Scaffold this active site. Sequence first.
Site, PDB file in Angstrom:
ATOM      1  N   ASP A  15       6.169   0.103   6.194  1.00 40.18           N
ATOM      2  CA  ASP A  15       5.191   0.337   5.117  1.00 40.18           C
ATOM      3  C   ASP A  15       3.745   0.207   5.594  1.00 40.18           C
ATOM      4  OD1 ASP A  15       6.029  -2.825   3.417  1.00 40.18           O
ATOM      5  OD2 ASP A  15       5.096  -2.471   5.377  1.00 40.18           O
ATOM      6  N   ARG A  29      -1.663   0.194   4.132  1.00 38.39           N
ATOM      7  CA  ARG A  29      -0.448  -0.396   3.603  1.00 38.39           C
ATOM      8  C   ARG A  29       0.104   0.515   2.511  1.00 38.39           C
ATOM      9  NH1 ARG A  29       3.514  -2.174   1.207  1.00 38.39           N
ATOM     10  NH2 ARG A  29       4.233  -4.345   1.182  1.00 38.39           N
ATOM     11  N   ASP A  34       7.976  -2.229  -0.897  1.00 42.28           N
ATOM     12  CA  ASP A  34       8.325  -3.281   0.021  1.00 42.28           C
ATOM     13  C   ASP A  34       9.426  -2.844   0.982  1.00 42.28           C
ATOM     14  OD1 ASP A  34       6.694  -5.365  -0.847  1.00 42.28           O
ATOM     15  OD2 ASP A  34       8.385  -6.760  -1.116  1.00 42.28           O
ATOM     16  N   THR A  35       9.174  -2.697   2.266  1.00 41.70           N
ATOM     17  CA  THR A  35      10.288  -2.423   3.178  1.00 41.70           C
ATOM     18  C   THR A  35      10.741  -3.686   3.888  1.00 41.70           C
ATOM     19  OG1 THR A  35       8.632  -1.760   4.790  1.00 41.70           O
ATOM     20  CG2 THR A  35       9.786  -0.013   3.651  1.00 41.70           C
ATOM     21  N   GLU A  37      11.266  -6.029   7.007  1.00 40.48           N
ATOM     22  CA  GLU A  37      10.385  -6.321   8.114  1.00 40.48           C
ATOM     23  C   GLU A  37      11.063  -6.127   9.465  1.00 40.48           C
ATOM     24  OE1 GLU A  37       6.590  -7.407   7.029  1.00 40.48           O
ATOM     25  OE2 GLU A  37       8.066  -5.825   6.633  1.00 40.48           O
ATOM     26  N   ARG A  81      -6.704  -3.878   4.861  1.00 41.44           N
ATOM     27  CA  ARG A  81      -5.883  -2.651   4.878  1.00 41.44           C
ATOM     28  C   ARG A  81      -6.146  -1.702   3.730  1.00 41.44           C
ATOM     29  NH1 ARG A  81      -0.081  -5.242   5.480  1.00 41.44           N
ATOM     30  NH2 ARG A  81      -0.915  -6.427   3.676  1.00 41.44           N
TER      31      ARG A  81
END
Length: 135
Positions: A15, A29, A34-35, A37, A81
Amino acid sequence: LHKEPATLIKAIDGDTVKLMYKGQPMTFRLLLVDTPEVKHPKKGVEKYGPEASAFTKKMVENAKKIEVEFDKGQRTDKYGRGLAYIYADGKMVNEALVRQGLAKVAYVYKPNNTHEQHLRKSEAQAKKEKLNIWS
Protein backbone atom coordinates in the site's frame (compact mmCIF):
# COMPACT_ATOMS: atom_id res chain seq x y z
CA LEU A 1 -12.01 15.12 -7.21
CA HIS A 2 -9.79 14.94 -10.25
CA LYS A 3 -6.85 12.89 -11.42
CA GLU A 4 -3.32 14.11 -11.98
CA PRO A 5 -0.41 12.40 -13.72
CA ALA A 6 2.54 10.99 -11.90
CA THR A 7 5.45 8.76 -12.84
CA LEU A 8 6.39 5.56 -11.07
CA ILE A 9 9.67 5.68 -9.21
CA LYS A 10 9.46 2.60 -7.02
CA ALA A 11 6.79 0.27 -5.61
CA ILE A 12 7.58 -0.21 -1.90
CA ASP A 13 4.96 -2.64 -0.70
CA GLY A 14 1.27 -3.43 -0.93
CA ASP A 15 0.00 0.00 0.00
CA THR A 16 3.01 2.26 -0.49
CA VAL A 17 4.50 3.47 -3.74
CA LYS A 18 7.06 6.19 -4.54
CA LEU A 19 6.07 8.45 -7.42
CA MET A 20 7.33 11.56 -9.16
CA TYR A 21 4.56 14.09 -8.67
CA LYS A 22 4.86 17.62 -10.08
CA GLY A 23 8.62 17.22 -10.39
CA GLN A 24 9.51 15.84 -6.97
CA PRO A 25 9.81 12.31 -5.57
CA MET A 26 7.05 11.54 -3.08
CA THR A 27 6.00 8.49 -1.12
CA PHE A 28 2.26 7.82 -1.48
CA ARG A 29 0.17 5.80 0.98
CA LEU A 30 -2.94 4.23 -0.64
CA LEU A 31 -6.11 5.75 0.85
CA LEU A 32 -8.67 3.57 2.67
CA VAL A 33 -6.90 0.25 2.46
CA ASP A 34 -4.80 -1.91 4.71
CA THR A 35 -2.52 -4.56 3.19
CA PRO A 36 -0.58 -7.20 5.11
CA GLU A 37 2.97 -6.07 5.89
CA VAL A 38 6.19 -7.26 4.34
CA LYS A 39 8.57 -5.41 6.69
CA HIS A 40 8.21 -3.97 10.22
CA PRO A 41 10.29 -5.69 12.91
CA LYS A 42 7.09 -6.75 14.71
CA LYS A 43 6.23 -9.75 12.56
CA GLY A 44 8.13 -8.76 9.43
CA VAL A 45 6.23 -10.61 6.71
CA GLU A 46 2.55 -11.11 7.50
CA LYS A 47 0.55 -13.62 5.43
CA TYR A 48 -0.44 -12.31 1.96
CA GLY A 49 2.05 -9.54 2.58
CA PRO A 50 4.34 -10.65 -0.26
CA GLU A 51 1.31 -11.33 -2.49
CA ALA A 52 -0.27 -7.87 -2.06
CA SER A 53 3.17 -6.37 -2.58
CA ALA A 54 3.72 -8.21 -5.85
CA PHE A 55 0.22 -7.34 -6.98
CA THR A 56 0.64 -3.61 -6.38
CA LYS A 57 4.07 -3.76 -7.97
CA LYS A 58 3.04 -5.56 -11.11
CA MET A 59 0.04 -3.34 -11.51
CA VAL A 60 1.98 -0.07 -11.39
CA GLU A 61 5.08 -1.33 -13.18
CA ASN A 62 3.09 -2.62 -16.16
CA ALA A 63 1.00 0.51 -16.51
CA LYS A 64 1.50 2.98 -19.27
CA LYS A 65 -0.22 5.83 -17.35
CA ILE A 66 -0.27 6.40 -13.54
CA GLU A 67 -2.65 9.00 -12.09
CA VAL A 68 -3.10 10.14 -8.51
CA GLU A 69 -6.35 11.36 -7.07
CA PHE A 70 -6.33 13.31 -3.74
CA ASP A 71 -9.49 13.20 -1.61
CA LYS A 72 -11.17 16.29 -0.03
CA GLY A 73 -9.35 16.28 3.35
CA GLN A 74 -5.68 16.38 4.26
CA ARG A 75 -3.40 15.29 1.46
CA THR A 76 -0.38 14.22 3.50
CA ASP A 77 -0.15 12.17 6.67
CA LYS A 78 2.11 12.84 9.70
CA TYR A 79 4.95 10.92 7.99
CA GLY A 80 4.87 13.27 5.03
CA ARG A 81 3.26 10.64 2.81
CA GLY A 82 0.78 11.72 0.14
CA LEU A 83 -2.72 10.33 0.76
CA ALA A 84 -4.37 9.35 -2.51
CA TYR A 85 -6.28 6.98 -4.79
CA ILE A 86 -3.80 5.61 -7.32
CA TYR A 87 -4.92 4.72 -10.90
CA ALA A 88 -3.01 2.39 -13.31
CA ASP A 89 -4.29 2.77 -16.88
CA GLY A 90 -7.64 3.89 -15.55
CA LYS A 91 -8.06 1.16 -12.88
CA MET A 92 -7.92 2.09 -9.18
CA VAL A 93 -5.13 0.11 -7.49
CA ASN A 94 -6.85 0.57 -4.13
CA GLU A 95 -10.04 -1.14 -5.35
CA ALA A 96 -8.21 -3.94 -7.23
CA LEU A 97 -6.41 -4.93 -4.05
CA VAL A 98 -9.61 -5.07 -2.09
CA ARG A 99 -11.54 -6.81 -4.88
CA GLN A 100 -8.88 -9.58 -4.77
CA GLY A 101 -8.92 -10.20 -1.03
CA LEU A 102 -5.41 -8.68 -0.79
CA ALA A 103 -6.42 -5.71 1.39
CA LYS A 104 -9.13 -4.75 3.89
CA VAL A 105 -10.93 -1.40 3.99
CA ALA A 106 -8.98 0.66 6.61
CA TYR A 107 -10.30 2.76 9.47
CA VAL A 108 -11.88 5.70 7.71
CA TYR A 109 -11.26 9.37 8.43
CA LYS A 110 -13.72 11.87 7.04
CA PRO A 111 -13.64 13.80 5.02
CA ASN A 112 -11.14 11.51 3.28
CA ASN A 113 -13.74 8.90 2.39
CA THR A 114 -15.23 9.64 -1.03
CA HIS A 115 -14.66 6.09 -2.42
CA GLU A 116 -15.56 4.39 0.85
CA GLN A 117 -18.79 2.77 -0.38
CA HIS A 118 -17.34 1.50 -3.65
CA LEU A 119 -14.51 -0.14 -1.76
CA ARG A 120 -16.72 -1.70 0.89
CA LYS A 121 -18.81 -3.26 -1.91
CA SER A 122 -15.69 -4.75 -3.49
CA GLU A 123 -14.61 -5.96 -0.11
CA ALA A 124 -17.93 -7.72 0.50
CA GLN A 125 -17.69 -9.46 -2.89
CA ALA A 126 -14.15 -10.65 -2.17
CA LYS A 127 -15.45 -11.94 1.20
CA LYS A 128 -18.33 -13.82 -0.41
CA GLU A 129 -15.89 -15.30 -2.97
CA LYS A 130 -13.60 -16.10 -0.05
CA LEU A 131 -10.44 -14.77 -1.75
CA ASN A 132 -6.94 -14.73 -0.21
CA ILE A 133 -7.35 -12.90 3.11
CA TRP A 134 -10.92 -14.16 3.27
CA SER A 135 -10.22 -17.85 2.69
